[PDB]
Scaffold this active site. Structure first.
Site, PDB file in Angstrom:
ATOM      1  N   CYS A 299       0.833  -1.202   0.000  1.00 14.53           N
ATOM      2  CA  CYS A 299       0.000   0.000   0.000  1.00 14.53           C
ATOM      3  C   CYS A 299       0.868   1.253   0.000  1.00 14.53           C
ATOM      4  O   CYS A 299       1.602   1.508   0.958  1.00 14.53           O
ATOM      5  CB  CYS A 299      -0.952   0.024   1.202  1.00 14.53           C
ATOM      6  SG  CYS A 299      -1.752   1.631   1.378  1.00 14.53           S
TER       7      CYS A 299
ATOM      8  N   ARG B 123       0.197   4.714   2.823  1.00 16.18           N
ATOM      9  CA  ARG B 123       0.286   4.460   4.257  1.00 16.18           C
ATOM     10  C   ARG B 123       0.796   5.642   5.069  1.00 16.18           C
ATOM     11  O   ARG B 123       0.962   5.495   6.285  1.00 16.18           O
ATOM     12  CB  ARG B 123       1.184   3.262   4.539  1.00 16.18           C
ATOM     13  CG  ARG B 123       0.589   1.924   4.168  1.00 16.18           C
ATOM     14  CD  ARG B 123       1.581   0.835   4.498  1.00 16.18           C
ATOM     15  NE  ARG B 123       2.628   0.726   3.477  1.00 16.18           N
ATOM     16  CZ  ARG B 123       3.754   0.041   3.645  1.00 16.18           C
ATOM     17  NH1 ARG B 123       3.980  -0.587   4.799  1.00 16.18           N
ATOM     18  NH2 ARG B 123       4.656  -0.021   2.667  1.00 16.18           N
TER      19      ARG B 123
ATOM     20  N   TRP C  74      -9.109   6.575  -0.336  1.00 21.44           N
ATOM     21  CA  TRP C  74      -9.397   7.237  -1.603  1.00 21.44           C
ATOM     22  C   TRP C  74      -8.499   6.633  -2.669  1.00 21.44           C
ATOM     23  O   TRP C  74      -7.605   5.843  -2.370  1.00 21.44           O
ATOM     24  CB  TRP C  74      -9.180   8.749  -1.541  1.00 21.44           C
ATOM     25  CG  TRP C  74      -7.943   9.169  -0.844  1.00 21.44           C
ATOM     26  CD1 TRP C  74      -6.688   9.317  -1.394  1.00 21.44           C
ATOM     27  CD2 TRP C  74      -7.826   9.532   0.536  1.00 21.44           C
ATOM     28  NE1 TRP C  74      -5.804   9.742  -0.428  1.00 21.44           N
ATOM     29  CE2 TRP C  74      -6.478   9.881   0.764  1.00 21.44           C
ATOM     30  CE3 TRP C  74      -8.732   9.590   1.606  1.00 21.44           C
ATOM     31  CZ2 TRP C  74      -6.012  10.279   2.020  1.00 21.44           C
ATOM     32  CZ3 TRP C  74      -8.269   9.986   2.850  1.00 21.44           C
ATOM     33  CH2 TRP C  74      -6.917  10.323   3.045  1.00 21.44           C
TER      34      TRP C  74
ATOM     35  N   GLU D 274      -5.083   3.789 -10.556  1.00 23.78           N
ATOM     36  CA  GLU D 274      -5.901   2.583 -10.440  1.00 23.78           C
ATOM     37  C   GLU D 274      -7.094   2.646 -11.379  1.00 23.78           C
ATOM     38  O   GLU D 274      -7.459   1.647 -12.006  1.00 23.78           O
ATOM     39  CB  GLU D 274      -6.386   2.394  -9.014  1.00 23.78           C
ATOM     40  CG  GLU D 274      -5.397   2.668  -7.935  1.00 23.78           C
ATOM     41  CD  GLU D 274      -6.048   2.449  -6.569  1.00 23.78           C
ATOM     42  OE1 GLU D 274      -6.821   1.460  -6.435  1.00 23.78           O
ATOM     43  OE2 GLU D 274      -5.812   3.278  -5.669  1.00 23.78           O
TER      44      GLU D 274
HETATM   45  C1  HEM Z   1      -5.844   6.561   2.330  1.00 26.20           C
HETATM   46  C2  HEM Z   1      -5.728   6.444   1.005  1.00 26.20           C
HETATM   47  C3  HEM Z   1      -5.169   5.161   0.361  1.00 26.20           C
HETATM   48  C4  HEM Z   1      -4.525   5.147  -0.806  1.00 26.20           C
HETATM   49  C5  HEM Z   1      -4.212   6.370  -1.689  1.00 26.20           C
HETATM   50  C6  HEM Z   1      -4.155   3.786  -1.092  1.00 26.20           C
HETATM   51  C7  HEM Z   1      -3.470   3.370  -2.208  1.00 26.20           C
HETATM   52  C8  HEM Z   1      -3.270   2.054  -2.538  1.00 26.20           C
HETATM   53  C9  HEM Z   1      -2.992   1.502  -3.852  1.00 26.20           C
HETATM   54  C10 HEM Z   1      -2.843   2.290  -5.175  1.00 26.20           C
HETATM   55  C11 HEM Z   1      -2.863   0.180  -3.713  1.00 26.20           C
HETATM   56  C12 HEM Z   1      -2.581  -0.833  -4.839  1.00 26.20           C
HETATM   57  C13 HEM Z   1      -3.939  -1.428  -5.173  1.00 26.20           C
HETATM   58  C14 HEM Z   1      -3.884  -2.282  -6.400  1.00 26.20           C
HETATM   59  O1  HEM Z   1      -3.068  -1.978  -7.324  1.00 26.20           O
HETATM   60  O2  HEM Z   1      -4.692  -3.246  -6.443  1.00 26.20           O
HETATM   61  C15 HEM Z   1      -3.075  -0.159  -2.319  1.00 26.20           C
HETATM   62  C16 HEM Z   1      -3.024  -1.422  -1.767  1.00 26.20           C
HETATM   63  C17 HEM Z   1      -3.410  -1.789  -0.485  1.00 26.20           C
HETATM   64  N1  HEM Z   1      -3.949  -0.963   0.480  1.00 26.20           N
HETATM   65 FE1  HEM Z   1      -3.855   1.139   0.388  1.00 26.20          FE
HETATM   66  N2  HEM Z   1      -4.620   2.990  -0.058  1.00 26.20           N
HETATM   67  C18 HEM Z   1      -5.257   3.797   0.863  1.00 26.20           C
HETATM   68  C19 HEM Z   1      -5.857   3.367   2.024  1.00 26.20           C
HETATM   69  C20 HEM Z   1      -5.812   2.114   2.584  1.00 26.20           C
HETATM   70  C21 HEM Z   1      -6.502   1.704   3.813  1.00 26.20           C
HETATM   71  C22 HEM Z   1      -7.389   2.690   4.593  1.00 26.20           C
HETATM   72  C23 HEM Z   1      -6.206   0.410   4.034  1.00 26.20           C
HETATM   73  C24 HEM Z   1      -6.611  -0.552   5.166  1.00 26.20           C
HETATM   74  C25 HEM Z   1      -7.163  -0.115   6.305  1.00 26.20           C
HETATM   75  C26 HEM Z   1      -5.304  -0.017   2.948  1.00 26.20           C
HETATM   76  C27 HEM Z   1      -4.747  -1.264   2.789  1.00 26.20           C
HETATM   77  C28 HEM Z   1      -4.180  -1.727   1.615  1.00 26.20           C
HETATM   78  C29 HEM Z   1      -3.780  -3.083   1.322  1.00 26.20           C
HETATM   79  C30 HEM Z   1      -3.838  -4.301   2.269  1.00 26.20           C
HETATM   80  C31 HEM Z   1      -3.301  -3.117   0.076  1.00 26.20           C
HETATM   81  C32 HEM Z   1      -2.739  -4.374  -0.645  1.00 26.20           C
HETATM   82  C33 HEM Z   1      -3.954  -5.049  -1.286  1.00 26.20           C
HETATM   83  C34 HEM Z   1      -3.499  -6.286  -2.004  1.00 26.20           C
HETATM   84  O3  HEM Z   1      -2.412  -6.797  -1.636  1.00 26.20           O
HETATM   85  O4  HEM Z   1      -4.228  -6.754  -2.920  1.00 26.20           O
HETATM   86  N3  HEM Z   1      -5.104   1.048   2.101  1.00 26.20           N
HETATM   87  N4  HEM Z   1      -3.316   1.016  -1.636  1.00 26.20           N
HETATM   88  N1  LIG Z   2      -7.873 -12.499  -8.388  1.00 25.82           N
HETATM   89  C1  LIG Z   2      -7.473 -12.042  -9.495  1.00 25.82           C
HETATM   90  N2  LIG Z   2      -6.720 -10.939  -9.595  1.00 25.82           N
HETATM   91  C2  LIG Z   2      -6.546 -10.030  -8.604  1.00 25.82           C
HETATM   92  C3  LIG Z   2      -6.790  -8.688  -8.885  1.00 25.82           C
HETATM   93  C4  LIG Z   2      -6.619  -7.725  -7.897  1.00 25.82           C
HETATM   94  C5  LIG Z   2      -6.193  -8.100  -6.629  1.00 25.82           C
HETATM   95  C6  LIG Z   2      -6.002  -7.062  -5.550  1.00 25.82           C
HETATM   96  C7  LIG Z   2      -6.767  -5.787  -5.876  1.00 25.82           C
HETATM   97  N3  LIG Z   2      -7.021  -5.111  -4.591  1.00 25.82           N
HETATM   98  C8  LIG Z   2      -7.940  -3.982  -4.775  1.00 25.82           C
HETATM   99  C9  LIG Z   2      -7.469  -2.867  -3.879  1.00 25.82           C
HETATM  100  C10 LIG Z   2      -6.864  -3.192  -2.670  1.00 25.82           C
HETATM  101  C11 LIG Z   2      -6.428  -2.180  -1.832  1.00 25.82           C
HETATM  102  C12 LIG Z   2      -6.572  -0.865  -2.230  1.00 25.82           C
HETATM  103  C13 LIG Z   2      -7.202  -0.526  -3.432  1.00 25.82           C
HETATM  104  N4  LIG Z   2      -7.335   0.773  -3.830  1.00 25.82           N
HETATM  105  C14 LIG Z   2      -7.500   1.807  -2.975  1.00 25.82           C
HETATM  106  N5  LIG Z   2      -7.131   2.971  -3.328  1.00 25.82           N
HETATM  107  C15 LIG Z   2      -8.111   1.639  -1.613  1.00 25.82           C
HETATM  108  C16 LIG Z   2      -9.157   0.791  -1.258  1.00 25.82           C
HETATM  109  C17 LIG Z   2      -9.395   0.940   0.097  1.00 25.82           C
HETATM  110  O1  LIG Z   2      -8.514   1.885   0.579  1.00 25.82           O
HETATM  111  C18 LIG Z   2      -7.720   2.312  -0.471  1.00 25.82           C
HETATM  112  C19 LIG Z   2      -7.655  -1.543  -4.258  1.00 25.82           C
HETATM  113  C20 LIG Z   2      -5.933  -9.439  -6.345  1.00 25.82           C
HETATM  114  C21 LIG Z   2      -6.104 -10.403  -7.332  1.00 25.82           C
HETATM  115  C22 LIG Z   2      -7.835 -12.771 -10.743  1.00 25.82           C
HETATM  116  C23 LIG Z   2      -8.247 -14.095 -10.827  1.00 25.82           C
HETATM  117  C24 LIG Z   2      -8.479 -14.376 -12.159  1.00 25.82           C
HETATM  118  O2  LIG Z   2      -8.215 -13.235 -12.897  1.00 25.82           O
HETATM  119  C25 LIG Z   2      -7.816 -12.241 -12.026  1.00 25.82           C
HETATM  120  O1  XYL Z   3      -8.010  -0.281  -7.864  1.00 24.21           O
HETATM  121  C1  XYL Z   3      -7.640  -1.584  -8.337  1.00 24.21           C
HETATM  122  C2  XYL Z   3      -8.061  -1.743  -9.798  1.00 24.21           C
HETATM  123  O2  XYL Z   3      -9.460  -2.076  -9.856  1.00 24.21           O
HETATM  124  C3  XYL Z   3      -7.189  -2.737 -10.600  1.00 24.21           C
HETATM  125  O3  XYL Z   3      -5.823  -2.511 -10.240  1.00 24.21           O
HETATM  126  C4  XYL Z   3      -7.516  -4.226 -10.409  1.00 24.21           C
HETATM  127  O4  XYL Z   3      -6.630  -4.798  -9.438  1.00 24.21           O
HETATM  128  C5  XYL Z   3      -7.399  -5.068 -11.688  1.00 24.21           C
HETATM  129  O5  XYL Z   3      -7.015  -4.285 -12.829  1.00 24.21           O
END
Ligand code: HEM
Ligand code: A1BT3
Ligand code: XYL
Ligand code: H4B
Ligand code: ZN
Length: 409
Positions: free
Chosen positions: A108, A111, A280, A285
């Site tokens: 993330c 953070r 947010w 994304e």
């Molecule tokens: C406050 C504004 C925040 C921004 C701008 C932000 C931004 C991002 C972005 C761009 C990602 C990559 C997501 C992706 O490509 O799928 C991410 C991942 C993640 N965020 Fe943050 N986030 C925010 C808040 C939070 C909050 C509030 C939490 C939990 C309480 C959180 C927990 C996580 C986790 C666990 C991931 C990894 C998800 C995964 O491994 O699939 N985030 N964040």
């Molecule tokens: N599972 C498949 N892919 C797959 C795709 C995506 C992921 C992880 C995507 N997390 C979404 C995510 C997680 C954390 C933050 C964000 N954004 C934010 N700004 C945000 C949201 C809350 O606070 C900030 C968005 C994991 C696996 C799959 C299977 C078959 O084909 C595809």
């Molecule tokens: O905010 C996360 C977006 O929805 C994408 O990054 C998905 O993980 C798949 O494209």
């Protein structure tokens, strides 16, 4: 005592936090699995070290380590795990655990905000309707009329495992995805299975591109139930461009509130299977991944068309040229509508600064470069040149299977 370097600034930081790490990475001495996407019922023997470790850093964080209320609480939890083979966190231990699960989220980039997190204790919930009520309240609070605020809503912890609270949606607000009889897909192709799981459960689909999905809420292991979020609670940005008047004709929009609901929260050995968290968006994304992934909306075709671009060669960079315009448009639309959003330059610079603090006041900051570096313009953001150590700390957010692959229906 490891060293990470920034090759754009020559700033060097020393990581000692990783010594506290505990879980596995996937990598060995002789293989690096840093680019693997997914990295893969309890007993009470397992539960106390996890509570002890947690409760030790909790009292330590409020400057009361090892003393009276600490020893009482360790003994208190020890006794309750003997009695119940589980235990319950205080309100303050739940808030600390949640914030630190975000603080340890190595993937993330946002953070710097980890301590500014509103926790909603939903551990008294018992039904899907109650889950619906808590989730609506989460959405309304976190959206704050566009002035987004971070929040998490925490449903009861896993107990046996056959009684599990689950939000079956991937995000609280996600657009529907329908395949067509001619093979193509309308809406968001990411969600086509879940869209059909709702249609299965009697959802009536408006069958457009940007149909806000209903919630599927599972309470205490029972069958999941459909609820439509009140539309007034679903804030959406129509996407326009600050040069290209034809950009409105594209008819694009996105929701303001990203709120992940399919993850699992681990605090002190306890498992919260329903814990939707929201912050947010970073612009990319939506603009890069959502809009331009081939497996998603995949709009580079239709944007470069309207941009009048030489699309017959890859080397004309028409793809890159339209990717940037699409992202200028997401940012401009969100900011003109006063809906909180951050650009990949602002967010990655803030994350470098965050890393500075985390090595100062904590000794390190677990960080996954594969995920921290934004999916466009990688090397003109400062995190591209930042070395990062990745390691698993707890409390944490873990992945978990989709409930329909596992729920004894
Ligand atoms: C406050 C504004 C925040 C921004 C701008 C932000 C931004 C991002 C972005 C761009 C990602 C990559 C997501 C992706 O490509 O799928 C991410 C991942 C993640 N965020 Fe943050 N986030 C925010 C808040 C939070 C909050 C509030 C939490 C939990 C309480 C959180 C927990 C996580 C986790 C666990 C991931 C990894 C998800 C995964 O491994 O699939 N985030 N964040
Ligand atoms: N599972 C498949 N892919 C797959 C795709 C995506 C992921 C992880 C995507 N997390 C979404 C995510 C997680 C954390 C933050 C964000 N954004 C934010 N700004 C945000 C949201 C809350 O606070 C900030 C968005 C994991 C696996 C799959 C299977 C078959 O084909 C595809
Ligand atoms: O905010 C996360 C977006 O929805 C994408 O990054 C998905 O993980 C798949 O494209
Ligand atoms: C194969 C690779 O690990 C996978 O495509 C990753 C790459 N980096 C990513 N980084 C972020 N922020 N989000 C992602 O979904 C991915 N996908
Ligand atoms: Zn590795």
């Amino acid at each position: 005592f490891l060293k990470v370097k920034n090759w754009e600034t020559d700033v060097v930081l020393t990581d000692t936090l990783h010594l506290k790490s505990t879980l596995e990475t996937g990598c060995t001495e002789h293989i690096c699995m840093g680019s693997i996407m997914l990295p893969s019922v309890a007993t009470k023997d397992q539960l106390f070290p996890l509570a002890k470790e947690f409760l030790d850093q909790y009292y330590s964080s409020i400057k009361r380590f090892g003393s009276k209320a600490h020893m009482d609480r360790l003994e208190e939890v020890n006794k309750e795990i003997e009695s119940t083979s589980t235990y319950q966190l205080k309100d303050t231990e739940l808030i600390y655990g949640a914030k630190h699960a975000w603080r340890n989220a190595s993937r993330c980039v946002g953070r710097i905000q980890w301590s500014k997190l509103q926790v909603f204790d939903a551990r008294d919930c018992t039904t899907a309707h109650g889950m619906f009520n808590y989730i609506c309240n989460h959405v309304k609070y976190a959206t704050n009329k566009g002035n987004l605020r971070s929040a998490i809503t925490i449903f009861p912890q896993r107990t046996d495992g056959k009684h599990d609270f689950r939000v079956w949606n991937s995000q609280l607000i996600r657009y529907a995805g329908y395949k067509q009889p001619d093979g193509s897909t309308l809406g968001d192709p990411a969600n086509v299975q879940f869209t059909e799981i709702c249609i299965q459960q009697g959802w009536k689909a408006p069958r457009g591109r940007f149909d806000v999905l209903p919630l599927l809420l599972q309470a205490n292991g029972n069958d999941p139930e459909l609820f439509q979020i009140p539309p007034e609670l679903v804030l959406e940005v129509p996407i326009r461009h600050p040069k290209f008047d034809w950009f409105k004709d594209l008819g694009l929009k996105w929701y303001g509130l990203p709120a992940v609901s399919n993850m699992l929260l681990e605090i002190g050995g306890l498992e919260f299977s329903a814990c939707p968290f929201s912050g947010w968006y970073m612009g990319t994304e939506i603009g890069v991944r959502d809009y331009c992934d081939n497996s998603r909306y995949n709009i580079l075709e239709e944007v470069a068309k309207k941009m009048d671009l030489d699309m017959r060669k890859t080397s004309s960079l028409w793809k890159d040229q339209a990717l940037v315009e699409i992202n200028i448009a997401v940012l401009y639309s969100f900011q003109s509508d006063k809906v909180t959003i951050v650009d990949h330059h602002s967010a990655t610079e803030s994350f470098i600064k965050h890393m500075e603090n985390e090595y100062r006041c904590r000794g390190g900051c677990p960080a996954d470069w594969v995920w921290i570096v934004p999916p466009m313009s990688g090397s003109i953001t400062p995190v591209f040149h930042q070395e990062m150590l990745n390691y698993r700390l707890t409390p944490s957010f873990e992945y978990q299977p989709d409930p329909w692959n596992t729920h004894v229906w």
